[PDB]
Amino acid sequence: NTASWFTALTQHGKEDLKFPRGQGVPINTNSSPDDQIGYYRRATRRIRGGDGKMKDLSPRWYFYYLGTGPEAGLPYGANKDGIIWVATEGALNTPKDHIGTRNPANNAAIVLQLPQGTTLPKGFYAE
């Protein structure tokens, strides 16, 4: 009943999303150095195509702070298909339930922006 705080990263290539061991956490001025840790979750959608058959759209990757979201129970590093982990140096490996997720009724999504020098895999674009 709740959404990611940020807009999604859309996967346009065959590469899966992945970041080096200090990159990938979206910028949020209303968060602290301890909170800068979370995961991206892949969300695939299916639509009626041109032949009338079902077809997959491009996968979307949504960021959630650690301890929040559809995989709030997973500890950092947990093995699960469709889940990739990110953290910045100094972040605390504790659940961020104090941040939680977004209610689109009273909060717009934060435009996802990565800090200067973030290395993305092929098929991903940083605004």
From Swiss-Prot:
Q: What is the effect of changing residue 125 to A?
A: Partial loss of RNA-binding
Q: What modifications follow translation?
A: ADP-ribosylated. The ADP-ribosylation is retained in the virion during infection.
Q: What is the lineage of its organism?
A: Viruses, Riboviria, Orthornavirae, Pisuviricota, Pisoniviricetes
Q: What's this protein's name?
A: Nucleoprotein
Subcellular location(s) of the protein: Virion; Host cytoplasm; Secreted; Host extracellular space
Say which family it is in: Belongs to the betacoronavirus nucleocapsid protein family.
Cite the record's note on assembly: Homodimer, homotetramer, homooligomer with RNA. Both monomeric and oligomeric forms interact with RNA. Interacts with protein M. Interacts with protein E. Interacts with NSP3; this interaction serves to tether the genome to the newly translated replicase-transcriptase complex at a very early stage of infection. Interacts with host NLRP3 and ABHD8; these interactions disrupt the association between NLRP3 and ABHD8, increasing NLRP3 stability, ultimately leading to increased inflammasome activation.
Q: What is the effect of changing residue 16 to G?
A: In strain: Delta/B.1.617.2
* UniProt-reported outcome of changing residue 47 to A: Partial loss of RNA-binding
**Where do the segments described as Disordered lie?**
16-36
User: Which domain of life does the protein's organism represent?
Assistant: Viruses
Record-listed RNA binding positions: 45, 60, 102
Chain segments carrying region RNA-binding:
1-127
Described by its record, this protein's role is as follows: Packages the positive strand viral genome RNA into a helical ribonucleocapsid (RNP) and plays a fundamental role during virion assembly through its interactions with the viral genome and membrane protein M. Plays an important role in enhancing the efficiency of subgenomic viral RNA transcription as well as viral replication. Attenuates the stress granules formation by reducing host G3BP1 access to host mRNAs under stress conditions. May block host chemokine function in vivo, facilitating viral replication and transmission. Acts by being secreted into the extracellular space where it competes to host chemokines for binding to host glycosaminoglycans (GAG).
Q: Which residues form the CoV N NTD domain?
A: 1-127
Write down the species.
Severe acute respiratory syndrome coronavirus 2
